[PDB]
RNA sequence: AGACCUGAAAUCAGGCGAGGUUACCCGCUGAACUUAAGCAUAUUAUUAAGCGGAGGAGAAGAAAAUAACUAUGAUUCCCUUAGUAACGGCGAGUGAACCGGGAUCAGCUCAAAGUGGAAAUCAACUGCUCUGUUGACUUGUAGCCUCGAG
RNA sequence: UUUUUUGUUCCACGUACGGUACGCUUUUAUAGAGUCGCGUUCAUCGGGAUUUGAGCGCAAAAUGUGUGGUAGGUUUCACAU
């Protein structure tokens, strides 16, 4: 779509809508972010504060998967397993058990709020609001590696 | 720079129109590739494609949960079922001298895996008489096998789910398990702070 | 079971004891003894080795702390330098007697 | 004018999928089929026949 | 075995039994010319274990190269350009002096095929390669299977292109893992990452 | 006088090398315009030009490897990691790898020992469909062995 | 051309002088040097108290050596040969 653009439309104005006065010249202003120390000082504040200078310690050959951990939140959960919610409402007897690595996270985090049925929660880490939560639905907690 | 948008991180101040690939041949390598799978298995016709490979836990902890496909068996998993390790590779099982077995768990899984292919595996005499070993002569009773299977489909890898479903027992409500993750982190940490304060 | 973080950390698993492998201890041999004290006869010890035997010949830990500045320097490494006055530690030993 | 201008579009398959549901739909009705052919002698649509 | 006995007391240089002998050989070579023939190996030890042979056509030559530093080649060491490359002096070169030596023995031994090299003694203004070389021409070679993979036209001049043991080297081949991720060949995975990858779809 | 050792000669007998081609491939050698709104480090670029060498492909290749996991398992290529870790008048700019998903899949052999009841080996020239005569070779040619063990 | 197949096609009929596997047990004949490595100089790298290379000087070891992305020592562990 050529067609549609500017330039189709603005063809036949001599300025060609950059302006009689300034111009389009190549490279006013330098190129790429060049400038921004002085120049276009007043624009990297605000719009990009903290760009300039250096913070944290560095890491040599840092390695994701080494820090990785997906998290599911306690809200969720039963989104992960609907047949067991109708079995485990009923019978208080047995608990529809929730292996949260089968569907692919590792942290468990109390963010939500949970039905009262009793369950089994098993995950590598749980935060500390979440084992709380999880408690007062009756439900229990188990680790693994 | 005008403006509120990115500051722009472009990598074009070489000389890139050299090296610029284009994927044109995508579909006419697709066909090419498809040509010399079935040219090879105009000769094999009877004999299945590939050879066959091991179960095998990926390495680091992200994809630890997952089972995929691995290079070749061992010489320990084939000593067990009675392979030698010479001898694999005409029937069509990929040895792995380097792969040891540290569990007994990923050992009887692939030692399955073996024993239910050396089920399948039909052996042709070489003629004109049966000759037991060098699993063994088939005669000429012979049930009908289908032609190149490609192994990997044959006989393939389901990630298998389900828990059932478990009483809530004592001790089970009782331990909190924040605080004993909690000590596990922060004894590793001090060990050798705790080894000056006990001495 | 088991638990992610700790000591005692990782997945439950019946472990193999695997077998003994490469990676068999590459010991010196009576054999392979008798080949190197023939050729340290023949060929003898290097000027660099001449001056740390003489110097632990002295005794005295200050001279011999010097030994291991020496063998440093000459062979680039605190662990090379330390095998080295140790072998002829054992040479002077002998030789004693 | 270079080789690499980008030549194909990459359409969703869903919007695929309803297209063809739409252009299907539009078979049928001799509304939209004497609108876009000779529709005198033919005794149906969607014109069925046997195997 | 004897060859057991020549690499333990090779291994001892400093030695005055080898620095006498060294000192003697070092003198016979600077005298002779540049490259040229010996008529059997002087370490057989040590040729041997790069797989020389003595059969006919195997062969065994001499090279002797300058030790030291080249300067950059400019006339009166007048660069023209930005103050870090005004550097004549203390310049290296990528290569080292082993596969330099392979290297003058392509118009010397055009047909003949280089297999290896190694050190047969040095000198402050020099330093000695004796090169394994091989006739891919001769029945003895080319009938044989265990050297019929030299005889193939994939290996003429692989002193030229960095393939020999002192070639492979200097590419750092020989060492491989997280060091040598960079460098199929140097320029190879350079090409790789700096192409502009444009698929079909986008 | 005769054994070797070393070095020559020959239009000696029979062989091999040289030069050409540029799209891709291997090795050396090596800039500046340009960007930084100046410029010198940096950038352009480990690029162009220069000098060598190939092949239908080339190079790479069966770990002196990744990892720190329930561990993986030659090499190459694709997708992804990732415009990330890191480099940088920490300015301008630069910038990989492991894991993961695919194409494709193939492993191996010399030196380090052992024929020593016996060079069993190899080439050249001649002779019938594999003998003979010279030489190479014990300063080591066959067989055996290559860490997955032997 | 199927024997010499850029991986194996059909029936018919063959064989052990040799040579190679496999099981149990015993085991030390044992694995590449002016090379590895280190100190410095120069180039190169994302590789930073050195990624890789090169020159010069030093120059190893055998329950050893190399690597484990911060220089250093003591004590373990893992991985490669």
Redesign the interface.
Known sequence: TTRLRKTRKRRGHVSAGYGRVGKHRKHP?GR??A??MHH?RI?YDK??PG?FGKVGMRHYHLLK??Y?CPTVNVDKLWSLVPA?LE??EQSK???????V??S?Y?KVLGKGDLPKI?V?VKA?????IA?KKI?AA???????? | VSKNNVLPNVHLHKWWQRYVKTWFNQPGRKQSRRLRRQEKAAKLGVVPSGLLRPIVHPPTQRYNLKVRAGRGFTLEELKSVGLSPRVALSIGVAVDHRRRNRSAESLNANVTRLKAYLAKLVLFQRGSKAKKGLPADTPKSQIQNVKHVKISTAMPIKASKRCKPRAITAEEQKFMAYATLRKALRDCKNVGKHEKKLA | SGIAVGLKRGYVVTKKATPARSRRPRKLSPRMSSIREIIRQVAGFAPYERRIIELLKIGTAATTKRALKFAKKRLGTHRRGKGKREELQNVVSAQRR | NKTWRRWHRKVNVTQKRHAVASAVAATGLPALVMARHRIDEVPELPLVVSE | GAYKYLEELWKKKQSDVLRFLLRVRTWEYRQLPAVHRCTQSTRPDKARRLGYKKKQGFVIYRVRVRRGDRKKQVHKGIVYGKPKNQGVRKQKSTRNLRAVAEEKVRKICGGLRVLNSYWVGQDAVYKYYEVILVDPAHNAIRNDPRINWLCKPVMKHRECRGLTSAGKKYRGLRTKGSGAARLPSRRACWKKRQAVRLRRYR
């Not at chain 1, 007897?93 to 292996?99: E, L, N, S």
């Not at chain 1, 590598?124 to 500390?128: E, G, I, L, N, V």
């Open positions: 202003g790429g972010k400038g921004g276009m624009n719009y990009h760009y998967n080494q990785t067991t079995k485990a007897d047995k608990a529809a058990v929730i292996d690595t089968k692919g590792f009793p089994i590598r880490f749980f935060s500390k084992e408690k009756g439900g229990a907690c188990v680790l693994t590696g």
